[PDB]
Design a protein around this nucleic acid. Structure first.
Ligand code: NA
Ligand code: NA
Ligand code: NA
Ligand code: NA
Length: 327
DNA sequence: GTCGG
DNA sequence: GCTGATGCGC
DNA sequence: CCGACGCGCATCAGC
């Protein structure tokens, strides 16, 4: 299907989704709208009525009614109204800043802070994360072309190996599945010395080396097992500099590493299907391990996993290449 | 808002 | 000061 | 009808 097919409807549902999440603070409604937009975005036909759309899982009575209004009038009165609402449109907007969620956006708008310009004039009211989100507001909304992700991976793999050749690092996400672009860089890291029964500095050493070579430019958060920050590729001589990008690095116990790589590689639809299969096969798979299930539903100890394939073998599933994990 | 036990 | 709740992003 | 739809880190709220 193509955007122009039911783009009006999916755009409408997505906009409704955002107001539910950022203004009404109804996360489940936010996801209901997203689910509806997704199922419709995959429908290979230009919808002619709400009834037609209602046959799709995720589209109920209310969304069907909204589709009827949109099809007959080319808009939704409720959406048009909230769109022009100064307060709501501002709260919704501010959450685009990383660090500013529904609560913060609401507080800011309540005190007259509604724009980036306003945020810029009120630095003392923003925490460290929010300040970084503001500074890179534009860059963070740009996608990362695969070619750049490759350049970024080169650097990450090189520096990690440089700190300790025994580290194992894997860039996951859609990138690992072959995507032509990514929204950020997700790095999974492990070390043989680190197991579930196991140093509290394995992550630090890597983050530090990446900062030393000036790849990592800012830190949103950093703990013993998870780092979230900002990075930027070196500027091509006198050529325009690259935009700053979001990068996360997670340290995971060796014995849980591949369940992690499998999970963070996705896609989400694939994960859902694989776990479903695992269950019907007597196994339960989460991001950390795969465990057998007894005849009464009791989970046993986690099974040994030394590769993604081990996971597939357990559930009698043929190994699936990342490129083929779209679903 | 949608689904389903 | 410490402990648990909350916000946030994923 | 009516409940469902996980966790690390930064920071706050309460003691
Ligand atoms: Na439906
Ligand atoms: Na935000
Ligand atoms: Na946001
Ligand atoms: Na070595």
């Amino acid at each position: 299907p193509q955007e122009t097919l039911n783009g009006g409807i999916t755009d409408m549902l997505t906009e409704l989704a955002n107001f539910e999440k950022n203004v009404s603070q109804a996360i489940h409604k936010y996801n209901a709208y997203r689910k509806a937009a997704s199922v419709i975005a995959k429908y290979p036909h230009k919808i002619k009525s709400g009834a037609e759309a209602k046959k799709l899982p995720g589209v109920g009575t209310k969304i069907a009614e909204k589709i009827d209004e949109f099809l007959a009038t080319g808009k939704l009165r409720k959406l048009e109204k909230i769109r022009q609402d100064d307060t709501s449109s501002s709260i919704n907007f501010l959450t685009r800043v990383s660090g500013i969620g529904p609560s913060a956006a609401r507080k800011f708008v309540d005190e007259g802070i509604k724009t980036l310009e306003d945020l810029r004039k009120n630095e003392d009211k923003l925490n460290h994360h929010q300040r970084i989100g503001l500074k890179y507001f534009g860059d963070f909304e740009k996608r990362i072309p695969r070619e750049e992700m490759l350049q970024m991976q080169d650097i990450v793999l090189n520096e990690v190996k440089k700190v300790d050749s025994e580290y194992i690092a894997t860039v996951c996400g859609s990138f690992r599945r072959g995507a032509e672009s990514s929204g950020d860089m997700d790095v999974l890291l492990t070390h043989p010395s680190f197991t579930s029964e196991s140093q509290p500095k394995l992550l630090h050493q890597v983050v530090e080396q990446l900062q030393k070579v000036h790849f990592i430019t800012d830190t949103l958060s950093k703990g013993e097992t998870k780092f979230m920050g900002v990075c930027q590729l070196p500027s091509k001589n006198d050529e325009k500099e690259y935009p700053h990008r979001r990068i996360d690095i997670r340290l995971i116990p060796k014995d849980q590493y591949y369940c992690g790589v499998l999970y963070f590689t996705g896609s989400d639809i694939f994960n859902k299907n694989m776990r479903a299969h695992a269950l019907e096969k007597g196994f339960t798979i989460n991001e950390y391990t795969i465990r057998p299930l007894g005849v009464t539903g009791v989970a046993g100890e986690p099974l040994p996993v030394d590769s993604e394939k081990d996971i597939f073998d357990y559930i009698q599933w043929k190994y699936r290449e990342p490129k083929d994990r779209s679903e």
